[PDB]
Amino acid sequence: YIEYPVLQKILIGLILGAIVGLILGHYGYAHAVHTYVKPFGDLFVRLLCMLVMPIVFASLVVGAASISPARLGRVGVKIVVYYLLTSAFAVTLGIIMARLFNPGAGIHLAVGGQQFQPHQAPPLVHILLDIVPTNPFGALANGQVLPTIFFAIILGIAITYLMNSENEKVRKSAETLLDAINGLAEAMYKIVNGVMQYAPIGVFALIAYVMAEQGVHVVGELAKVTAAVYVGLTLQILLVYFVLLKIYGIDPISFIKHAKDAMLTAFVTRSSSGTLPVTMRVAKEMGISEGIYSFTLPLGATINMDGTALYQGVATFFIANALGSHLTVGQQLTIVLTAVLASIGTAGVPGAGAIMLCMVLHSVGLPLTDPNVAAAYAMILGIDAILDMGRTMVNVTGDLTGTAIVAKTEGTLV
Amino acid sequence: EYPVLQKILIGLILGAIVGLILGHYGYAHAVHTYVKPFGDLFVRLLCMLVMPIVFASLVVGAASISPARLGRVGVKIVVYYLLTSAFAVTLGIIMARLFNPGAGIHLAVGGQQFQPHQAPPLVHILLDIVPTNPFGALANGQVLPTIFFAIILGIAITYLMNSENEKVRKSAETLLDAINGLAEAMYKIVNGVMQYAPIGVFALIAYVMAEQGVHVVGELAKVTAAVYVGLTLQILLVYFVLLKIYGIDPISFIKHAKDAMLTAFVTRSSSGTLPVTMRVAKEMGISEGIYSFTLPLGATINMDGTALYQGVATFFIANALGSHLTVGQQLTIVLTAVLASIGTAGVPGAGAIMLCMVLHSVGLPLTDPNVAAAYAMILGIDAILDMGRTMVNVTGDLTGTAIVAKTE
Amino acid sequence: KYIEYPVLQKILIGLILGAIVGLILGHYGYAHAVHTYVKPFGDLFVRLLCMLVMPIVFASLVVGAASISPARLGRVGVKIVVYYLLTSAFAVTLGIIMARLFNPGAGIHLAVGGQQFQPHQAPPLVHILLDIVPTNPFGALANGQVLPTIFFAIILGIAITYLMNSENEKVRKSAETLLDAINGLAEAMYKIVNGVMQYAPIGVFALIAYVMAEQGVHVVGELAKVTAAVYVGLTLQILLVYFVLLKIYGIDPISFIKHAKDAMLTAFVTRSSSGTLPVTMRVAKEMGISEGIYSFTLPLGATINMDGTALYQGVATFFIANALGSHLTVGQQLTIVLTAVLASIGTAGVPGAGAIMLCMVLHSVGLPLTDPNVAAAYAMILGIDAILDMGRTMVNVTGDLTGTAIVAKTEGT
Ligand SMILES: [Hg+2]
Ligand SMILES: [Hg+2]
Ligand SMILES: [Hg+2]
């Protein structure tokens, strides 16, 4: 059948696809690929941008409700502060690395015969006022990004306040609504898994055309991306986690020795949740309180922002850079912080890195319909699989780093 | 608030007489200005629920039929309906080509004939089944994407009900429970709208008769006929053969269903009839533990009745527009319609509701005067057709529960 | 850094303080600078409100419809509903009456862009009646078609009640779940308003600051003229209907008020049918209303009481239309006003329902809230809504008791 290690399939689809593309590039048929292979790629891209709205919205409602004070616990408030200070660093490293290696420059895409031309921007007044949806159903209906973010947050928070009410009529109503929204977000995730079953074919078709038509330069450019990620990735573990543990009297060396297979599971399954049974067992091996890890671990699975913050730092810069538009530090963080803010509750979430990207593009007015934007996004989407293994692996490590720092601040260790 | 079907038939029979005399020496135009708006109110009220029912109905439907959520006695009854609908489709088209309903009524209302557009590149029509934004598809009536999303969602929910996580599992249970109920309410609303249907159906044919001459009655009777003969040809040609193939006697089988069919034929309700259906299944000696499960499904998932309705209706509608339609597209459009109606067996006037959904999905704006005036015709006789629809649905539900019961 | 100080106080402070600032900056000041710098805060406030107008009206009506819906409706229910229908009827007539009595809007002929607003007119009745029916309800709901939304929200709520009358427990829990989540969306939308009223002091400051600075000093008289027309019709309701209705039911009106005294005073000051509900029930027991009666009728008047809104709209509608330059007749008025009221059912409060309905009414008529004039006209009412909304609630609560007592003594079982 096709149930064989889904990730194996996708990496086979990428490696094999680039070879097919690239040799049909050299003496081949850039155009034939474009007429015949590519539409299979397009289907894949559509199946992704599809759920981009339901997941962002329904995910944020649930996510907001999670962190919403003071439905949030006191042991919880400390773990929230944790992810906030780490996301802060994860963002800096993101940008830093994306500037350090310069992914995108060197590939000047001008696909229809013309380069893409960002039309910016309205007056700040006009753009701040417009985050407030004129009509919340409509925002959601026709893909209005920022408004949906803002309404989804303000609603998730509202729900929690309703679950602090004496009126039981009221309390269950909220509990019902949130539960229903939850199941939606939940179903959306299961749908993604199904799409990832098609991903090996679709991703084959995507890079096949990119390779066939962009030339061979691309492979260097993509390795440039992945590199900037995995080096910021490990730079995170070493520079922040290890420091934060050191600074909490915890031993970083022996810490790793327990996390070892929990990171390796995460690296391999791409799944904060798939990995969560392993994570929890390791948390116990380190001797974290039962009452603690059984609460804080199922959070970092969803609200851990550090992984995605790194992805976007590099994805953002590549995507904008390949388009040809030179992007500054101020725009960078502006963009990235906003993606991260809105990512909360989508930690995994199969391929959230790429999903946030769409939602961020849609937000900066770069129509996915444009051929350049399209062929640009298609590149990152290709290697997303690779990137998403590091993304999860850092997520999990940081979840343990945090749940162990917070564990010790409760006096429940060994 | 007196027997509802009586009223719709009273209104139709009565309405054509009124329209037809007022047509002849009368004032086709007057009717058009004063009588007709009541008719248009009716068509709107229907096209209204076309979206919610299709979406909500399919989410629920797909979650029924979904693997691994489906049961063993269930898998067989589904396999039953799949292979009966197969044949029901064939008869539909076949009868629709046999009698030629529509041609000979050449409607060109505005002083101009309707002119269907075809067709974007296969590539572009296939990529487009995938909604770019699901809320959007839903919001501004995109048919194929809504089907595609509603199926892919229903299946997803079932996987969530096979989860270790009780939080996850309850949430799915809830979402589904609320979509169901939306579905459910949608139907309740139809029952009420059918309360206006006698006035509405009066107004509709009144105009059609007053304006399209007397040729119409022949053309409509042509439809009715093509359904009722496909209808009984289904009972005899498939059910009887399936009963015989499973040692059940066709003749004495009917002797038991006799009132259950008569009830179905007169209530238009697979569900309204359900108590009578189950009573007969007991009289025939089916296991309690089998008919109490399989009969409530046939009432929702039985595609055979609709499959004949769409076959014929589709061919009439298109044919009357002027557009001659081939066997290939006939089937393609039909499979699509039936394969989206799952979980709406009855569901009062489902037959017509689907038609609207298939029309909106295949070019053909319901706002267009030709398209409108043609759909107004079938909408008129829907009541007649919808009685045979249900009656055959119910017969095939017993045939299925009996065949499956025997294998147990 | 914490302004969790009495929320109403803040809005009143913001109004009085805002008008002075604007008015002095108006005279020799910088109408323009206010427009460029203070106003954007006033606009952000109008956006947060106009935001919820769709979800509150829809999800609110669904629940509302369900609550009045037969035959889920009790016999103790049927009477209280009939009560409210006959009181809203009069509540409307007084609204229009007072709106015509004082003439708010005239004398302020607003032509803001350098051009006066022009209401379009009306398609044939056929076309407007057919169009109350949503061709696609998700679409109605998604892009703000008001009339089709109303009609779908009612026809939905009612259907949901019938599903609760089914022997199929599948069917029955399904309906119960759906309603449970629609309510609760409703409920959350209300919580989101409470947060918006938190910024309302700042926003209401900015709003009148500009209208004062730019519209002159004639505005303050015109607004006092509104509030007057409401508060007098408001007490004309108590004296002219409730008191005549209590008397006509052998009940003593003066000694009735002696119990309601604080129950009305709470409502006047909290702006909250729900916040006041504890105080209200305590008073219905003091008046010696049955426990199994007020435990049902008081939580209804809290949501379905239409009389308070009926007055507000009578005046708001006339002022808004009058200021724009369109003179509006008594037919037009009720047609506009019945409609709003009839669709307000289940939104009694709901922090600021009065203004909320008005948008929804403005959108429905054909006055695009983006229009410079319409905006500057709505902005004025939005400003004093807070004042009007205290009276609104207070009248509502008096009439909930007047009702629960009239129905109560017709019982004694
Ligand atoms: Hg996308
Ligand atoms: Hg329709
Ligand atoms: Hg508004």
Residue A223 amino acid letter: A
C130, C139, C159: residue with CB nearest B185: C159
The reply to whether A194 touches chain C by the CB within 8 Å rule is: no
Instruction: List CB contacts of A267: < 8 A, sequence separation 6 or more.
Output: A389, A390, A392, A393
Question: Alpha-carbon Rg of chain C, whole angstroms?
Answer: 21
Q: Are B36 and B207 in contact (CB under 8 A)?
A: yes
Instruction: List CB contacts of A260: < 8 A, sequence separation 6 or more.
Output: none
Structure tokens at C321: 């239309």
Q: Shortest CA distance to C397 belongs to which of C274, C311, C227, C285?
A: C274
Whole-angstrom distance, CA of residue B70 vs CA of residue B143 = 27
Q: Shortest CA distance to C134 belongs to which of B54, B51, B39?
A: B51
Count CB atoms within 10 A of the CB of residue C188. Answer: 28
Count CB atoms within 10 A of the CB of residue A11. Answer: 15
State the angle between helix axes of C372-409 and C7-27 in degrees (0 to 180), rounded to the nearest 10. 150
Neighbour-count burial for A219-244, b at 16+ CB within 10 Å, e otherwise: eebbebbbbbbbbbbebbbeebbbeb
Side-chain-side CA neighbours of A300 within 13 Å: the count stands at 36
The reply to whether B237 touches chain C by the CB within 8 Å rule is: no
Residue C322 amino acid letter: N
CATH number of the domain enclosing A121: 1.10.3860.10
Whole-angstrom distance, CA of residue B402 vs CA of residue C179 = 39
The nearest alpha carbon in chain C to A140 belongs to C142
A42, A138, A186: residue with CB nearest B172: A186
Whole-angstrom distance, CA of residue B131 vs CA of residue A191 = 13
Q: Shortest CA distance to A189 belongs to which of A303, A59, A349, A54?
A: A349
Mapping DSSP to helix (H, G, I), strand (E, B) and coil, where does residue A270 land? coil
Integer angstrom CA distances of residue A285 from A123, A241, A409: 55, 19, 18
Structure tokens at A339: 């993606």
Q: Dihedral sign, CA of A174, A179, A182, A187?
A: negative
Structure tokens at A318: 């590549």
Known binding residue C350? Answer is: yes
Q: Shortest CA distance to B207 belongs to which of B36, B345, B381?
A: B36
Distance from CA of A390 to the nearest CA of B (A): 26
DSSP C35: I
Residue A103 amino acid letter: P
Residue A197 amino acid letter: Q
Whole-angstrom distance, CA of residue C61 vs CA of residue C256 = 32
Count CB atoms within 10 A of the CB of residue A346. Answer: 27
Side-chain-side CA neighbours of B100 within 13 Å: the count stands at 10
Q: Are C38 and C25 in contact (CB under 8 A)?
A: no
DSSP C71: T
Q: What is the residue whose two structure tokens read 């039929």? A: B65
The nearest alpha carbon in chain B to A145 belongs to B133
Q: Are B208 and B216 in contact (CB under 8 A)?
A: yes
Is the omega angle on the peptide bond into residue C71 within 30 degrees of 0, that is, cis? Answer: yes
Q: Dihedral sign, CA of A278, A279, A281, A282?
A: positive
Is the omega angle on the peptide bond into residue B68 within 30 degrees of 0, that is, cis? Answer: yes
Is the omega angle on the peptide bond into residue C407 within 30 degrees of 0, that is, cis? Answer: no
Resolution in A: 3.2
Q: Which residues of B touch C171 (CB under 8 A)?
A: 181, 184
Whole-angstrom distance, CA of residue A214 vs CA of residue A208 = 10
Is the omega angle on the peptide bond into residue A70 within 30 degrees of 0, that is, cis? Answer: yes
Q: Are B246 and B80 in contact (CB under 8 A)?
A: no
Q: Shortest CA distance to A152 belongs to which of C231, C192, C95?
A: C192
Question: Alpha-carbon Rg of chain A, whole angstroms?
Answer: 21
Q: Which ligand is nearest to the CA of C361?
A: 3
Q: Dihedral sign, CA of B236, B237, B243, B248?
A: positive
Whole-angstrom distance, CA of residue A86 vs CA of residue A92 = 10
The secondary structure of A22-62 as a DSSP string is: HHHHHTT-HHHHHHHTHHHHHHHHHHHHHHHHHHHHHHHHH
Q: What is the residue whose two structure tokens read 């007055």? A: C311
DSSP C395: H
Integer angstrom CA distances of residue C113 from A316, B13, C44, C222: 42, 60, 20, 21
Q: Dihedral sign, CA of C62, C68, C70, C71?
A: positive
Mapping DSSP to helix (H, G, I), strand (E, B) and coil, where does residue A207 land? helix
Whole-angstrom distance, CA of residue B153 vs CA of residue B179 = 11
Residue B325 dihedral angles phi and psi, to the nearest 5°: -125, 135
Whole-angstrom distance, CA of residue B75 vs CA of residue B67 = 9
Count CB atoms within 10 A of the CB of residue C373. Answer: 19
List helix spans (H) across B213-347.
Answer: 215-234, 241-245, 250-267, 274-283, 288-301, 304-320, 327-338
The reply to whether A127 touches chain C by the CB within 8 Å rule is: no
DSSP H or E stretch at residue C100: helix C75-101
Q: Which residues of A touch C141 (CB under 8 A)?
A: 137
Whole-angstrom distance, CA of residue C281 vs CA of residue A20 = 78
Neighbour-count burial for A27-48, b at 16+ CB within 10 Å, e otherwise: eeeeeebeeebbbbbbbbbbbb
Q: Shortest CA distance to B131 belongs to which of B122, B140, B123?
A: B140
Question: Alpha-carbon Rg of chain B, whole angstroms?
Answer: 21
Integer angstrom CA distances of residue A113 from A105, A109, B110: 19, 9, 45
The secondary structure of B85-98 as a DSSP string is: HHHHHHHHHHHHHH
Whole-angstrom distance, CA of residue C105 vs CA of residue C222 = 6
Structure tokens at C22: 């604007």
Q: Shortest CA distance to C372 belongs to which of C215, C226, C256, C242?
A: C215
Q: Are A332 and A97 in contact (CB under 8 A)?
A: no
Q: Shortest CA distance to C237 belongs to which of C264, C259, C277?
A: C264
Whole-angstrom distance, CA of residue C276 vs CA of residue C268 = 9
Q: Shortest CA distance to B302 belongs to which of B392, B238, B215, B373?
A: B392
Integer angstrom CA distances of residue A110 from A107, A213, A314, B300, C49: 10, 12, 21, 54, 44
Structure tokens at B9: 């038939």
Residues lining ion ligand 1 (Cβ < 5 A) are A 49, 358
How many domains does chain B divide into?
1
Longest CA pairwise span in chain A (Å): 74
Q: Are C143 and A133 in contact (CB under 8 A)?
A: no
Structure tokens at A141: 């209906």
Q: What is the residue whose two structure tokens read 């090996």? A: A200
Neighbour-count burial for B254-275, b at 16+ CB within 10 Å, e otherwise: bebbeebbebbbbbbbbbbbbe
Longest CA pairwise span in chain C (Å): 74
The secondary structure of A308-350 as a DSSP string is: HHHHHHHHHHHHHHHTT----HHHHHHHHHHHHHHHTT-S-ST
Whole-angstrom distance, CA of residue C355 vs CA of residue C230 = 14
3-state DSSP helix/strand/coil percent for chain A, to nearest 5? 75, 0, 25
B44, B135, B188: residue with CB nearest C162: B188
Whole-angstrom distance, CA of residue C324 vs CA of residue C112 = 10
Structure tokens at A196: 């990832």
The reply to whether B21 touches chain C by the CB within 8 Å rule is: no
The nearest alpha carbon in chain A to C57 belongs to A135
| 3-state SS string for B373-389 | HHHHHHHHHHHHHHHHH
Whole-angstrom distance, CA of residue A81 vs CA of residue A65 = 16
Mapping DSSP to helix (H, G, I), strand (E, B) and coil, where does residue C359 land? helix
Residue A104 dihedral angles phi and psi, to the nearest 5°: 120, -55
Q: Which ligand is nearest to the CA of A56?
A: 1
State the angle between helix axes of A168-214 and A371-408 in degrees (0 to 180), rounded to the nearest 10. 130
The CA-based angle A336-A341-A346, given to 5 degrees, is: 105
B131, B156, B170: residue with CB nearest A179: B170
Whole-angstrom distance, CA of residue C382 vs CA of residue C15 = 11
Our separate counts of H helices and E strands in chain C read 17, 0
Residues preceding chain discontinuities in chain A with C to N over 2.5 Å: none
Q: Are A223 and A35 in contact (CB under 8 A)?
A: no
Whole-angstrom distance, CA of residue C99 vs CA of residue C84 = 22
Q: Are A282 and A261 in contact (CB under 8 A)?
A: yes
Q: Which of residues 143-162 of A touch B (CB under 8 A)?
A: 143
Q: How far does the centroid of ligand 3 lie from the alpha carbon of residue A365, in Å?
A: 27
Q: Which residues of C touch B188 (CB under 8 A)?
A: 159, 162-163
Q: Write down how long chain A is.
A: 414
Q: Which residues of B touch A183 (CB under 8 A)?
A: 157, 160, 171-176
Integer angstrom CA distances of residue A228 from A314, A381, B395: 7, 16, 67
Structure tokens at B60: 């629920």
Whole-angstrom distance, CA of residue B360 vs CA of residue B382 = 18
Identify the experimental approach: X-ray
Instruction: List CB contacts of C24: < 8 A, sequence separation 6 or more.
Output: none
Bridge partners (DSSP) of residue A104 are A106
Residue A19 amino acid letter: I
Structure tokens at A114: 């013309």
Q: What is the residue whose two structure tokens read 């898998």? A: B75
Burial class from Cβ neighbours inside 10 Å (0-12, 13-18, 19+) for residue B71 reads: exposed
Q: Which residues of C touch B51 (CB under 8 A)?
A: 136-139
Integer angstrom CA distances of residue A359 from A194, A283, A355, A368, B364: 20, 34, 7, 10, 34
Q: Are A202 and A44 in contact (CB under 8 A)?
A: yes
Long-range contacts of B213-218 (CB under 8 A, 24+ apart): B213/B23, B214/B20, B214/B23, B215/B104, B215/B105, B216/B105, B216/B377, B217/B16
Say yes or no for a CB contact (<8 Å) between C184 and A173: yes
Q: Shortest CA distance to B139 belongs to which of A144, A146, A149, A147?
A: A144
Q: What is the residue whose two structure tokens read 């689907």? A: B354
Q: Write down how long chain C is.
A: 413
Whole-angstrom distance, CA of residue C256 vs CA of residue C284 = 10
Whole-angstrom distance, CA of residue A206 vs CA of residue A384 = 12
State the angle between helix axes of B36-65 and B143-160 in degrees (0 to 180), rounded to the nearest 10. 30
State the angle between helix axes of A290-303 and A272-285 in degrees (0 to 180), rounded to the nearest 10. 150
Interface partners of chain B (CB pairs < 8 Å, 3 or more) are A, C
Instruction: List CB contacts of A7: < 8 A, sequence separation 6 or more.
Output: A268, A269, A270, A385, A389
Query: Domain range holding C331?
Result: 1-413
Q: Are C296 and C76 in contact (CB under 8 A)?
A: yes
Neighbour-count burial for C96-116, b at 16+ CB within 10 Å, e otherwise: bbbbeebebbeebebebeeee
Structure tokens at B139: 């919001």
Whole-angstrom distance, CA of residue B314 vs CA of residue B321 = 11
Residue A106 dihedral angles phi and psi, to the nearest 5°: 105, -35
Q: Shortest CA distance to C39 belongs to which of C379, C410, C399?
A: C379
Is the omega angle on the peptide bond into residue C350 within 30 degrees of 0, that is, cis? Answer: yes
Instruction: List CB contacts of C209: < 8 A, sequence separation 6 or more.
Output: C18, C19, C21, C22, C25, C34, C38, C39, C42
Residue B279 CA, chain-centre distance (Å), reads 26
Q: Dihedral sign, CA of A139, A144, A147, A153?
A: positive
Count CB atoms within 10 A of the CB of residue A2. Answer: 9
Instruction: List CB contacts of C356: < 8 A, sequence separation 6 or more.
Output: C49, C52, C53, C56, C57, C347, C350
Integer angstrom CA distances of residue B286 from B100, B294, C201, C298: 41, 11, 72, 54
Q: What is the residue whose two structure tokens read 């809830």? A: B174
Structure tokens at C119: 């209401």
Count CB atoms within 10 A of the CB of residue B247. Answer: 8
Neighbour-count burial for A279-295, b at 16+ CB within 10 Å, e otherwise: bbebbeebebbeebbeb
C47, C53, C187: residue with CB nearest A132: C47
Q: Which residues of C touch B192 (CB under 8 A)?
A: 155, 159
The nearest alpha carbon in chain C to A162 belongs to C188
